From Swiss-Prot, chains A, B:
It comes from Dictyostelium discoideum (Social amoeba). The keyword Transferase does not apply. This is Signal transducer and activator of transcription A. Disruption phenotype: Cells are hypersensitive to the chlorinated hexaphenone DIF. They form slugs, but there is little or no stalk cell differentiation. After several days of developmental arrest very small spore masses appear that are supported by columns of apparently undifferentiated cells. Residues 197-241 bind DNA. Residues 337-440 form the SH2 domain.
Length: 461, 461
């Protein structure tokens, strides 16, 4: 954590390199129309000097990529730094492709016969909402999926037809999954916005989008140019699949055709997916998996190694995937957990040691380790001597509309003063004894008529 | 209270006077067979000297009666002193009648022509179980109802037939209420034991027994001699009437044809009846109405006066009678109240002031003032700020066999540590915070298999 250096360094590079390519795209096409009918030396001295600058710059661009690729693989990045590495990675990739087309162009001059290069165009995803688990039928925003066309200084070609989107699944083993696959291109920017409509589930299989357009050479040769695959994603048809899809998506994004990945590589991906599940802000998340939650995960499901394997995942998701389906779908859980109301990821010994001798009625809510997707309230009992008593909250305790976990909680005098997970002044998270009613404040049943004074009342309510 | 003097003084008198009558009964009949055929002075000088002793002693006996009658009427007597005044009263009455028959006899000699005297016999109740509320069909013990025949030194008569028991009701406005009404007389003691069998209810009306026997004069004149009425009592036929009967019995014993009685006279009677209701020992009762309970009664139902009226009673019994039906009939209540577990007679302000700032879960059980025969648990709540919350225990909270008040109590985490009414070392009653489970110790559900350790358990049980 705190890779604040590596990244802010690379960000300044990209902002500069961004401007270098502007003056370079101009400098090139300029020095390109000014090349005589033909002549070698005197005429091609300035082009060779450019090629030099390009190759040099290409190299810096390669060092950068490795630097980033190594950070994601070797450092646990905090939410902000994480979202940034991803952003820098995407932009540097584009810069690299841009520079590449300019160079291939200047090269098709200095050293022709080298052949190939094909039409010097390129389709890249300037922005995408993937990865993510999409619910069948939702439609993307007008600026969520934008495709950018990259060219050389001089365009020795024309574009025929619109840019098309094609869904692909490479675990290959009979209709239209998308709506609005064809989009024209904006001139001032050469971009194409795809407000795709997802018309079909994927059957819990990762998927990627591919864009392509037909380019007609200046010699009337038609070539189809395509983009690399987008980030993976899955389309589900019922909130019942969110898990299987989400796990598959996570497993795919995490390992990517590999059997073993670093610990950092793994959690950096999960953190990313965890925030997407809980629909939290990527940069300033209300509550991201903390270092504590990571260690818990690293200990209870991974042997505490700094290298994770393919099959250790299958077991981790059996449990974890459930804890998340609960966070994303069970009413108020997400909100209550993001607040500190529900601690969540904690093991026995830890829940107990955190309660060692507290007034009776003190409790902490966390995830059952044997009952995936379920909570286990650990409270101190009334009976003497007072001992720590755990309670598995079961499905029937909650009911779809009426009793939601927060209702259930304020109905048992056995749950008095909560141990909330609050943030301190040095920002450090802490445990401060609120009162079941104070903490649940925002969820409590709003008393209409004021409190009765004088006779007798019912016991609990 | 503490009339320890008055009574222990009179007790020594009765024990002595008891022996004086022994030597007097002997001295008399002796000096009676030794009286010549007839002669006045010289012969009747010793008889006149006896008559003097008798009259003197009769007088001491009268001072004693008034002394006792005034104590019951002007001093609140504690259980022991109370049972004693009643015992002394009964024995002194008998001594008085005995002495009377001896004197009438010596007088029928010295001053005949004075006429009357009738056969010089007397039937007195040497012992009785009244007052009390009897359940139809029960049968008395062989020594619970004994009748004693008193005579003069010389018996100038014979007894024909057995001693009979006759039930009487003087609120007069078609069969056999008793079994075994006729009993013979034991010679060595001239007593008749009546193990009466109550064959009929009384319809909530006080009743008294009357004993009588036929005596045949030495001149063949037959006279029926009777005893004064026994203490009142009532026979009920169902536990539903215990109240109406008990109140009527209490009202009758308390006032006795009067409209106004002293405060002391009143409570001394209630104390007596209260111990009989709760089936407690008269001398060493586990828990008798305390001075506190008396003041409560004196304040909430009597205007705090030292003189009680007939109609103030009708209202008092409306409530109190119920609190007692609960003590005598509702399961474990009697035991729980006799223990200090249930305090009982306490008013609002008092219940609250006794709880002013106690840990949440602290409670005292007492009688509802608006809900006669019902309990109102006053406990401190969980909610903050913690305030005193009263709860009316209703009939459905309890069920005949399964849930008895003590079960109900140990089922709500809202009732934690009880404020028990315990006795201190100087014997003074006190409030010591036991634990709902410690105090209910003897009633708790006996856990078969030992306490589970390791997983999750249900919330309350």
């Amino acid at each position: 954590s705190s890779p604040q250096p590596i990244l802010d360094t690379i960000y300044k590079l990209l902002s500069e390199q961004e401007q270098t390519l502007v003056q370079m795209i101009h400098e090139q096409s300029l020095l390109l129309n000014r090349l005589p009918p033909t002549l070698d030396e005197n005429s091609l001295a300035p082009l060779k000097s450019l090629s030099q600058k390009q190759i040099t710059l290409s190299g810096q661009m390669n060092t950068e990529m490795s630097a980033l690729d190594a950070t994601k693989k070797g450092m646990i990045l905090e939410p902000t730094d994480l979202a940034k590495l991803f952003a820098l990675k995407q932009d540097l990739q584009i810069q690299f492709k841009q520079l590449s087309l300019l160079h291939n162009e200047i090269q098709s001059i200095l050293n022709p016969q080298h052949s190939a290069p094909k039409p010097n165009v390129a389709l890249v995803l300037k922005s995408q909402p993937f990865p993510v688990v999409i619910s069948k039928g939702k439609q993307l925003g007008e600026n969520q999926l934008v495709v950018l066309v990259l060219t050389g200084a001089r365009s020795n070609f024309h574009i025929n037809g619109p840019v098309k989107a094609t869904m692909i699944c490479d675990s290959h083993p009979p209709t239209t999954p998308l709506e609005m696959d064809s989009q024209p291109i904006y001139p001032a920017t050469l971009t194409a916005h795809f407000p795709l409509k997802f018309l079909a589930g994927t059957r819990k299989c990762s998927v990627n989008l591919k864009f392509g357009v037909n380019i007609r050479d200046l010699d009337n040769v038609t070539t189809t140019v395509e983009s690399d695959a987008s980030n993976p994603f899955v389309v589900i048809t019922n909130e019942c699949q969110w898990e299987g899809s989400a796990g598959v998506l996570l497993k795919k994004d995490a390992f990517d055709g590999q059997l073993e990945i670093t610990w950092a590589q793994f959690i950096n991906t999960l953190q990313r997916h965890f925030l997407i599940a809980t629909k939290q802000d990527p940069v300033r998340p209300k509550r991201p998996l903390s270092s504590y939650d990571l260690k818990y995960i690293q200990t209870h499901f991974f042997g505490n190694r700094s290298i994770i394997h393919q099959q250790d995942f299958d077991k981790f998701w059996v449990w974890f995937g459930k804890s998340m389906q609960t966070l994303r779908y069970q009413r108020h859980i997400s909100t209550l957990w993001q607040e500190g109301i529900i601690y969540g990821y904690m093991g026995r010994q830890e829940v107990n040691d955190a309660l060692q001798n507290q007034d009776p009625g003190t409790f902490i809510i966390r995830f059952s380790e044997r009952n995936p997707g379920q909570f286990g309230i650990a409270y101190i009992g009334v009976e003497m001597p007072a001992r720590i008593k755990h309670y598995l909250v079961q499905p029937n305790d909650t009911a779809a509309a009426k009793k939601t976990f927060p209702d259930f909680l304020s109905e048992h005098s056995q749950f008095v003063n909560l141990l909330q997970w609050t943030k301190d002044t040095n920002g450090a998270p802490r445990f401060l004894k609120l009162h079941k009613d104070t903490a649940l404040g925002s969820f409590a049943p709003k008393r209409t008529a004021p409190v009765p004074v004088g006779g007798y009342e019912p016991l609990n309510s």
